[PDB]
Amino acid sequence: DQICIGYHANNSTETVDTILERNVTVTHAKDILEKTHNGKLCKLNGIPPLELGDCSIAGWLLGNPECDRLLSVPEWSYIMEKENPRDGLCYPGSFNDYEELKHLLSSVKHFEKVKILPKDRWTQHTTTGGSRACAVSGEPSFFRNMVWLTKKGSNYPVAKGSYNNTSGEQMLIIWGVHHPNDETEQRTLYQNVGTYVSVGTSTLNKRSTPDIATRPKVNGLGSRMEFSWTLLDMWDTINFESTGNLIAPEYGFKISKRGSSGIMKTEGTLENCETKCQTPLGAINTTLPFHNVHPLTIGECPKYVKSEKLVLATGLRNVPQILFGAIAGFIEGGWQGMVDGWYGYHHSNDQGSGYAADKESTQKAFDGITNKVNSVIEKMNTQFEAVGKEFSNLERRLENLNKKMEDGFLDVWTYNAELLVLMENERTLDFHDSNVKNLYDKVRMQLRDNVKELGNGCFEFYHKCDDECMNSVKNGTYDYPKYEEESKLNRN
Amino acid sequence: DQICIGYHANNSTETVDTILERNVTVTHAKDILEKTHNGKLCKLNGIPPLELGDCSIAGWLLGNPECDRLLSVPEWSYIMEKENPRDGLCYPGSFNDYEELKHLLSSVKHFEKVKILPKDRWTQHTTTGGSRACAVSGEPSFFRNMVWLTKKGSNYPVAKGSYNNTSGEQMLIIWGVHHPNDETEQRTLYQNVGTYVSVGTSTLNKRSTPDIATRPKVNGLGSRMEFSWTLLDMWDTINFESTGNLIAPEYGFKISKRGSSGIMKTEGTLENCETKCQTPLGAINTTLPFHNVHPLTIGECPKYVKSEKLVLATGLRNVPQIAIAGFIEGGWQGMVDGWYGYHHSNDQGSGYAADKESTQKAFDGITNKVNSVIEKMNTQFEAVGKEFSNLERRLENLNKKMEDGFLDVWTYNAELLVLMENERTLDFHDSNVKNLYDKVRMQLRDNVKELGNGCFEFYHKCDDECMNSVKNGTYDYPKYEEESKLNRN
Amino acid sequence: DQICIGYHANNSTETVDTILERNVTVTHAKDILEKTHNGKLCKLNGIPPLELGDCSIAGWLLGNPECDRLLSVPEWSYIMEKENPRDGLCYPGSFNDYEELKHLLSSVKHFEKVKILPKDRWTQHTTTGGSRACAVSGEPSFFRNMVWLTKKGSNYPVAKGSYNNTSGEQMLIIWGVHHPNDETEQRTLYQNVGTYVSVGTSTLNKRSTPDIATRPKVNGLGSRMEFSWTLLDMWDTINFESTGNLIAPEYGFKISKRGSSGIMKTEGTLENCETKCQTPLGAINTTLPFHNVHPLTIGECPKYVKSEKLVLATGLRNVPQIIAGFIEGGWQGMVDGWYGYHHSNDQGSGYAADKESTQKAFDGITNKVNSVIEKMNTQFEAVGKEFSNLERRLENLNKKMEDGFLDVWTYNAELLVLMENERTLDFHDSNVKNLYDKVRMQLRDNVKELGNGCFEFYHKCDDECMNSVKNGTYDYPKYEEESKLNRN
Numbered sequence A: 001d002q003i004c005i006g007y008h009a010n011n012s013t014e015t016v017d018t019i020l021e022r023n024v025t026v027t028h029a030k031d032i033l034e035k036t037h038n039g040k041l042c043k044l045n046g047i048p049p050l051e052l053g054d055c056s057i058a059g060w061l062l063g064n065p066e067c068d069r070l071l072s073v074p075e076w077s078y079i080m081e082k083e084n085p086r087d088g089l090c091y092p093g094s095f096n097d098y099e100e101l102k103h104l105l106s107s108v109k110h111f112e113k114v115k116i117l118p119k120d121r122w123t124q125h126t127t128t129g130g131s132r133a134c135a136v137s138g139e140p141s142f143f144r145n146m147v148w149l150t151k152k153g154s155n156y157p158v159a160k161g162s163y164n165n166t167s168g169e170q171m172l173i174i175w176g177v178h179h180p181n182d183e184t185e186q187r188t189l190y191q192n193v194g195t196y197v198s199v200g201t202s203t204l205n206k207r208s209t210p211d212i213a214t215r216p217k218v219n220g221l222g223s224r225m226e227f228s229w230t231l232l233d234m235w236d237t238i239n240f241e242s243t244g245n246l247i248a249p250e251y252g253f254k255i256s257k258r259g260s261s262g263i264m265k266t267e268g269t270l271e272n273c274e275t276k277c278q279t280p281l282g283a284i285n286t287t288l289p290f291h292n293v294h295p296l297t298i299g300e301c302p303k304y305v306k307s308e309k310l311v312l313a314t315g316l317r318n319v320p321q322i323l324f325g326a327i328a329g330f331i332e333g334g335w336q337g338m339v340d341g342w343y344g345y346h347h348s349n350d351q352g353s354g355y356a357a358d359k360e361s362t363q364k365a366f367d368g369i370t371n372k373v374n375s376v377i378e379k380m381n382t383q384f385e386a387v388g389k390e391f392s393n394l395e396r397r398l399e400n401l402n403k404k405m406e407d408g409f410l411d412v413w414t415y416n417a418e419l420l421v422l423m424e425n426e427r428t429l430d431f432h433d434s435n436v437k438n439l440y441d442k443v444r445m446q447l448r449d450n451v452k453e454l455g456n457g458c459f460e461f462y463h464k465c466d467d468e469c470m471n472s473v474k475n476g477t478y479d480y481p482k483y484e485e486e487s488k489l490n491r492n
Numbered sequence B: 001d002q003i004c005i006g007y008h009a010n011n012s013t014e015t016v017d018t019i020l021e022r023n024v025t026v027t028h029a030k031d032i033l034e035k036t037h038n039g040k041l042c043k044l045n046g047i048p049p050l051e052l053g054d055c056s057i058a059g060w061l062l063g064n065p066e067c068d069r070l071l072s073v074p075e076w077s078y079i080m081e082k083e084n085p086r087d088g089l090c091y092p093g094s095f096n097d098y099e100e101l102k103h104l105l106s107s108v109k110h111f112e113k114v115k116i117l118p119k120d121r122w123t124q125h126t127t128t129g130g131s132r133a134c135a136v137s138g139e140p141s142f143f144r145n146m147v148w149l150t151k152k153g154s155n156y157p158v159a160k161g162s163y164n165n166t167s168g169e170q171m172l173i174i175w176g177v178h179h180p181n182d183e184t185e186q187r188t189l190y191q192n193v194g195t196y197v198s199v200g201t202s203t204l205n206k207r208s209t210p211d212i213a214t215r216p217k218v219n220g221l222g223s224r225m226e227f228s229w230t231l232l233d234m235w236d237t238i239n240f241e242s243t244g245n246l247i248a249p250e251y252g253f254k255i256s257k258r259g260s261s262g263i264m265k266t267e268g269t270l271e272n273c274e275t276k277c278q279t280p281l282g283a284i285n286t287t288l289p290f291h292n293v294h295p296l297t298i299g300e301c302p303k304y305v306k307s308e309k310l311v312l313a314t315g316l317r318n319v320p321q322i323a324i325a326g327f328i329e330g331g332w333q334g335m336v337d338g339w340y341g342y343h344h345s346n347d348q349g350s351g352y353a354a355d356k357e358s359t360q361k362a363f364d365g366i367t368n369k370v371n372s373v374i375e376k377m378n379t380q381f382e383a384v385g386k387e388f389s390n391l392e393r394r395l396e397n398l399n400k401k402m403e404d405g406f407l408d409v410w411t412y413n414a415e416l417l418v419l420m421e422n423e424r425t426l427d428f429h430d431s432n433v434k435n436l437y438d439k440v441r442m443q444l445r446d447n448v449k450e451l452g453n454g455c456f457e458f459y460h461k462c463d464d465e466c467m468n469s470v471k472n473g474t475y476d477y478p479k480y481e482e483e484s485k486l487n488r489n
Numbered sequence C: 001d002q003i004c005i006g007y008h009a010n011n012s013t014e015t016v017d018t019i020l021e022r023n024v025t026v027t028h029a030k031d032i033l034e035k036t037h038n039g040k041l042c043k044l045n046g047i048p049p050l051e052l053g054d055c056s057i058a059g060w061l062l063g064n065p066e067c068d069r070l071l072s073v074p075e076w077s078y079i080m081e082k083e084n085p086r087d088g089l090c091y092p093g094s095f096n097d098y099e100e101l102k103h104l105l106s107s108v109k110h111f112e113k114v115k116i117l118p119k120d121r122w123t124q125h126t127t128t129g130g131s132r133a134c135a136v137s138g139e140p141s142f143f144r145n146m147v148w149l150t151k152k153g154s155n156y157p158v159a160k161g162s163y164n165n166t167s168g169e170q171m172l173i174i175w176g177v178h179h180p181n182d183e184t185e186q187r188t189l190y191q192n193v194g195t196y197v198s199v200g201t202s203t204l205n206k207r208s209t210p211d212i213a214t215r216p217k218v219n220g221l222g223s224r225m226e227f228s229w230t231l232l233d234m235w236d237t238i239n240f241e242s243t244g245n246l247i248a249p250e251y252g253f254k255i256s257k258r259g260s261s262g263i264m265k266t267e268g269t270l271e272n273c274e275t276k277c278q279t280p281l282g283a284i285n286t287t288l289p290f291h292n293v294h295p296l297t298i299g300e301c302p303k304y305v306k307s308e309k310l311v312l313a314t315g316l317r318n319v320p321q322i323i324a325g326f327i328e329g330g331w332q333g334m335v336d337g338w339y340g341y342h343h344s345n346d347q348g349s350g351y352a353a354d355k356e357s358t359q360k361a362f363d364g365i366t367n368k369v370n371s372v373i374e375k376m377n378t379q380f381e382a383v384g385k386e387f388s389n390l391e392r393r394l395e396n397l398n399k400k401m402e403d404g405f406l407d408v409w410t411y412n413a414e415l416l417v418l419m420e421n422e423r424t425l426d427f428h429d430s431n432v433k434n435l436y437d438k439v440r441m442q443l444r445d446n447v448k449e450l451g452n453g454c455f456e457f458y459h460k461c462d463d464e465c466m467n468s469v470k471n472g473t474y475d476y477p478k479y480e481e482e483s484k485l486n487r488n
């Protein structure tokens, strides 16, 4: 009669990496890293994003004639923008604090356009002016959200405008100043030289003077237009005053919804699909804690890491046993007939052979491994990860600072995850061997000298053991005093 | 005769966490997180703070009439300010590089006010101007540290003033420029239009022109005042020149003491107490690696982690149940002398004991373990706090992301370290008990008989001296050889 | 006849650290931190650096008469500069966006010079101005790369100038505006009051007005000069216009080579040596992952930490024996392996060693060391950044970021080394005990354990017997009858 102790082996080919060995075959493994995406841009939470196409943020807000599809925009989840948009500032010029405006637009999910200074109120000036830089059907045109004030007759009276924010929320207002190319243009358009543009609110005070000089021609013009913005608070007034070179606003943008969003730089188009996490390459439909698709992401998303594989070993080592002899134990290798658990027995008494499994040790090890996996997974913080920021070309030091901070944090977390996986894999691999040896030691200690240790994990008895005795050994209820006299006689 | 190997147990309730099992009761434990405070604002190292009250830093430095108790201020440790103070710039306006000034004030612990430009030297101008936005008992007043210069008669001559820094340290000087509401105010205050204000030092050059326009009324006035500042070095000179719209300084703030300080944003009042670490909610009296009270602390304080529990297992696992059994059946609730030990049952009488060697080495190892976890933590002075304007949102976001990421890194590090360390400690105790059992078996050989419950049943009658020998490591197998062999057969 | 299981011991005095114990003597150890350096400033990859000496970047780029040796600088790898250079802006003034220029200079490597506005083109102005601040051999002089335009006779016509960037790469252009001290100076130099200087490119639009005021005297002058720069793109044009107070450029700086470079603040001189990693204190010749010389480095350089010691245990504990086995201590006679045996039969005694266990342990330790070393990424880092007096918050932010990352890495390295040392020292004991258990399991009941790690045989075990026991092919049935007879 025999009784042996061993573990479970199968035909799995999965491999894991530990700290002292690489490419170790395991029975079961878990992948906590996702590397796949659908390669499409979709709807977030059911709300489609805003597709700017070839337009830019400045072109959308100012009202470029090539951006007439965005004159009435519904609620959005994120903004899609190209790297180098073609239709932006049709009239050559600049845009002060552009990056700050783009950053503000990363927490706004809806705008409401309100007419604050109607065009017909300028009854002492000329409001129908344009340029061939922004041309519709050949004839010159202008921005659809701004008014160009020129002289009426042969005089330019002082232009005064005001607006009291009785809308209900913060309002965004944009104005501009025109810089001519020669004194001829200035005297043809505004009738006087030495003009000023003054804009004032409760917490704002600005006075700009036009610059007239010969400049290189961009879009066929040697002139420029400088744009500035402000955020008017509730129950607050904005005052405009100018002697010349004022590009007045007709519309003001009211922040109607607020939340978390961002600007995604991509060259693709939207497709009919839904998702909960959006990368510039495609959506992610996952429950795993990590991914390595793209750093920048919008929505609740797994952490990024510069890794190619991260596998957690949740099973035993796969060492298979290699003439109608006696089945060995855990010393030689695993068993392929034990399919009901991880650790078990094998009896060879008179009433047939057969395998079995020990439920207590298997349950304990399963609970421990599940707890380890859940501790690794669930001690990671997940939130909104809008990590897109823009910097001008006078802000190289700030851009380098942001790049270094992001790279350092990403490298730190990569190191953390990789080393954690390595140590945990080694610890679980040693755990399984410790458990098997502990079960063997318990069996030997409870069986005492009634048996004969064979040296390969098996126990040759000294008495005749029935299935009742075998289950007693498995149950840990073996009655040593009962068989003492019988076993002692056959020993010598 | 019987000898057994076991471990000590008690009636504890403290629970630790292990990466494999949660809620494991332990005999001893060490909490390395502090979660309490006194809820009061106290004195840092015996020096009281500067309680601004309803005043702002601009109001304190400019001389707001409602902050007359701050004209002379002693040495301080930190500044207490409200989130939205009331008495700031009584005259509506702005302040250039306000956040830079507030950051500079974070390393200054005392100021000395020096009269650098008296009011009586302006003998060619009028220096009694005032406004009703800054009013005392109904009549108009003005800032106490500044002079408003106005025409004397019907003339405003060119105003010139210079100062040489012979005080002995760096000096802070604040001036201002007035922006009227209409040309009428400009002409009845300064007699001419097209004025300038020029300030020049060895490393500074600034020229400003007033802006006259209609603005929404704040505090009743459509005018504004714009203030600037500079840091004058030792043995350096500052020049002032203006044809109008100049608010000249009367006093300068010399930096008398330097060090580490900060601005704490609270709404409370100072009380009578001492401390070493201060938080906006209260003071901390602790000597532990970690705390979870408030992020923005002033002083040498433990790192902040978003953890509600961080307990290091120092003692053994608590299995209460134990003739008498050994370590397989569980722990002993009667061995109150040490950690590992024995239990003998010879004919003289039963009794417990303790193994001094194993207990001492385990104690030293656990002590070194705890001290390595604790004394690897840099704790220097850091007054975490910075202010940004409404046009510096990107910088504010960068700073917030930096602090949040560092905090998350440190919480993950601490939690993982505690979990793995506790697992290793419990495994260490189990291994030590097993090693003691194995050593006893190895030295005791076949003269005894294992029972499977951790105990050994001898074959020779063993007295007290023999038992102290087997606990000593000086057991003599050959002497009990023939006697032991006889009865075993 | 005996066979024993033991481990190696020697006369080393190395010491490692562990999470449970400190000052542990080991047979073999590896130091993974380098604390030594050459002490000299060398050539990076065979290319010598740029030695500014007593000059500043502004002085080099403007043409300070004292810096007359840097008019034709060759290719370089990094720039050496002093903390407080002496020869800089000889004429007192400022330099707008100076730190941005210094940041841009950390990625260029040659800076070819191109004459864009030759001085002879100004036929309607006087171009021979100078000052005693920048005085050579007593007589007044001026910057060698700049032109000071004054009036000719009693007129100052409008000054215009253009340059189309057809060089083949980006260019750097610097101009200036002069601020006088009084109206007498302004009328003596430019003949008109109320002047302006206008500069315009396809993406720049700046207009400046002179400031006339009395200022403290620096270098004997109460007047100042303000300098600004721009980066002209390819096939772009820059326009200059002024009615006075213009310091026009004569040269432009075309970027010829781009790559990784930097600025080092040192007070030393270049010495004849070659290196690949350079610190402000010296050079590093290394094969080790770590170093604790100086935070700021240029080149292929190791990682930096606040660590005074980082030693990885690659061997056994040194517990020499005062023939016993592994219970007492190591053997000072086993010179061919980590774990081994010692036997004594009627041929003779002698030590030996195991091959499989020693090889497995060697491979495991080597893999551990290589994993610790090779998971640390390295790359070129431009740590050095400079900030102005009104950017204290940004400077503090940068300092806090660098310090925090560096303490994080220091803590990680320390904990990794401590836990790995504990793991190795437990691994060795586990391996020796596993060998002992394997031998006992194979040898069964035909022998007699003696407690110290040795086995006393019950039969007469010869040399072929002993190699069989070492091999793992011990025949239990062959000696079963003989062993059982004498045991009874």
Ligand SMILES: CC(=O)N[C@H]1[C@H](O[C@@H]2[C@@H](O)[C@H](O)O[C@H](CO)[C@@H]2O)O[C@H](CO)[C@@H](O[C@@H]2O[C@H](CO[C@]3(C(=O)O)C[C@H](O)[C@@H](NC(C)=O)[C@H]([C@H](O)[C@H](O)CO)O3)[C@H](O)[C@H](O)[C@H]2O)[C@@H]1O
Pocket: A129, A130, A131, A132, A133, A140, A150, A180, A181, A185, A188, A189, A220, A221, A223
């Ligand atoms: C309205 C118009 O066509 N003006 C042109 C100007 O005309 C003079 C007219 O005002 C006067 O009464 O009579 C004389 C003849 O006796 C002229 O006809 O003449 C200029 C040259 O002589 C033209 O200059 C050219 O303008 C180009 C630009 O056209 C646009 C543009 O595409 O930007 C469009 C409009 O003409 C105009 N917008 C208005 C008036 O509201 C803008 C305007 O010039 C902006 O200030 C841009 O600079 O220009 C090119 O700029 C070209 O380089 C220039 O020679 C006038 O178009």
Ligand SMILES: CC(=O)N[C@H]1[C@H](O[C@@H]2[C@@H](O)[C@H](O)O[C@H](CO)[C@@H]2O)O[C@H](CO)[C@@H](O[C@@H]2O[C@H](CO[C@]3(C(=O)O)C[C@H](O)[C@@H](NC(C)=O)[C@H]([C@H](O)[C@H](O)CO)O3)[C@H](O)[C@H](O)[C@H]2O)[C@@H]1O
Pocket: B129, B130, B131, B132, B133, B140, B150, B180, B181, B185, B188, B189, B220, B221, B222, B223
């Ligand atoms: C000094 C004074 O009372 N000025 C008031 C001004 O009167 C003139 C006086 O200077 C002249 O000699 O004679 C005429 C009569 O022939 C006046 O009496 O009249 C203004 C109305 O027309 C008042 O304006 C109002 O001022 C308000 C603010 O008043 C104060 C203030 O408390 O801020 C009063 C101060 O005395 C005055 N002067 C100084 C030197 O600080 C300041 C000054 O105007 C500031 O510079 C304000 O920018 O103003 C309100 O602003 C109100 O809206 C306005 O109508 C003059 O008070």
Ligand SMILES: CC(=O)N[C@H]1[C@H](O[C@@H]2[C@@H](O)[C@H](O)O[C@H](CO)[C@@H]2O)O[C@H](CO)[C@@H](O[C@@H]2O[C@H](CO[C@]3(C(=O)O)C[C@H](O)[C@@H](NC(C)=O)[C@H]([C@H](O)[C@H](O)CO)O3)[C@H](O)[C@H](O)[C@H]2O)[C@@H]1O
Pocket: C129, C130, C131, C132, C133, C140, C150, C180, C181, C185, C188, C189, C220, C221, C222, C223
């Ligand atoms: C060219 C010259 O010698 N100018 C000095 C000036 O003289 C006049 C001359 O131009 C006119 O035709 O005739 C009168 C007599 O009828 C004068 O001879 O007189 C000034 C004092 O009265 C001197 O002033 C001093 O200049 C110092 C600086 O000298 C330099 C310098 O080294 O920086 C000399 C340069 O030649 C001069 N000119 C140019 C074109 O660079 C510069 C120039 O003044 C700078 O722009 C200064 O902002 O200055 C000191 O500045 C000292 O404080 C001052 O009194 C003139 O040197």
Ligand SMILES: *[C@@H]1O[C@H](CO)[C@@H](O)[C@H](O)[C@H]1NC(C)=O
Pocket: A022, A023
């Ligand atoms: C482990 O596998 C990887 C890829 O499967 C291979 O590159 C590497 O050489 C393997 N390791 C060894 C020790 O062969």
Ligand SMILES: *[C@@H]1O[C@H](CO)[C@@H](O)[C@H](O)[C@H]1NC(C)=O
Pocket: A164, A165, A166, A235, A236, A237, B216
């Ligand atoms: C703006 O409107 C609100 C509400 O109608 C009013 O209280 C406030 O006085 C108005 N502003 C001004 C400057 O009158």
Ligand SMILES: *[C@@H]1O[C@H](CO)[C@@H](O)[C@H](O)[C@H]1NC(C)=O
Pocket: A285, A286
């Ligand atoms: C996305 O994942 C969910 C699991 O929550 C699954 O039910 C659904 O079918 C998946 N959709 C696609 C398109 O893969």
Ligand SMILES: *[C@@H]1O[C@H](CO)[C@@H](O)[C@H](O)[C@H]1NC(C)=O
Pocket: B022, B023
């Ligand atoms: C551990 O105990 C806490 C209460 O002390 C309980 O909230 C938690 O669910 C328990 N966890 C487990 C795994 O039993």
Ligand SMILES: *[C@@H]1O[C@H](CO)[C@@H](O)[C@H](O)[C@H]1NC(C)=O
Pocket: B164, B165, B166, B235, B236, B237, C216
């Ligand atoms: C300021 O005072 C110091 C010492 O009294 C003196 O050396 C210096 O020349 C003075 N400054 C000026 C501009 O005279």
Ligand SMILES: *[C@@H]1O[C@H](CO)[C@@H](O)[C@H](O)[C@H]1NC(C)=O
Pocket: B465, B468, B469, B472, B474
């Ligand atoms: C135990 O060992 C110590 C060795 O220092 C010895 O002095 C003592 O007598 C021993 N005890 C007994 C009972 O032999």
Ligand SMILES: *[C@@H]1O[C@H](CO)[C@@H](O)[C@H](O)[C@H]1NC(C)=O
Pocket: C011, C012
């Ligand atoms: C240690 O032993 C080696 C033998 O290889 C010898 O060369 C060396 O000098 C010895 N060192 C000391 C300090 O005894």
Ligand SMILES: *[C@@H]1O[C@H](CO)[C@@H](O)[C@H](O)[C@H]1NC(C)=O
Pocket: C022, C023
């Ligand atoms: C123990 O280690 C410390 C370094 O932490 C060292 O200064 C000291 O000399 C060492 N002592 C011994 C006895 O090795």
Ligand SMILES: *[C@@H]1O[C@H](CO)[C@@H](O)[C@H](O)[C@H]1NC(C)=O
Pocket: A216, C164, C165, C166, C235, C236, C237
């Ligand atoms: C500058 O030169 C380029 C040559 O490629 C030419 O295309 C361009 O028109 C020139 N610029 C101007 C303003 O003519």
Ligand SMILES: *[C@@H]1O[C@H](CO)[C@@H](O)[C@H](O)[C@H]1NC(C)=O
Pocket: C274, C285, C286, C287
């Ligand atoms: C640098 O170290 C290497 C060893 O890795 C050595 O071969 C070489 O000669 C050394 N060079 C110098 C200049 O020290």
Ligand SMILES: *[C@@H]1O[C@H](CO)[C@@H](O)[C@H](O)[C@H]1NC(C)=O
Pocket: C464, C467, C468, C471, C473
């Ligand atoms: C030991 O094993 C080797 C296997 O490489 C074999 O060649 C040799 O004959 C064996 N020796 C004995 C004595 O079994």
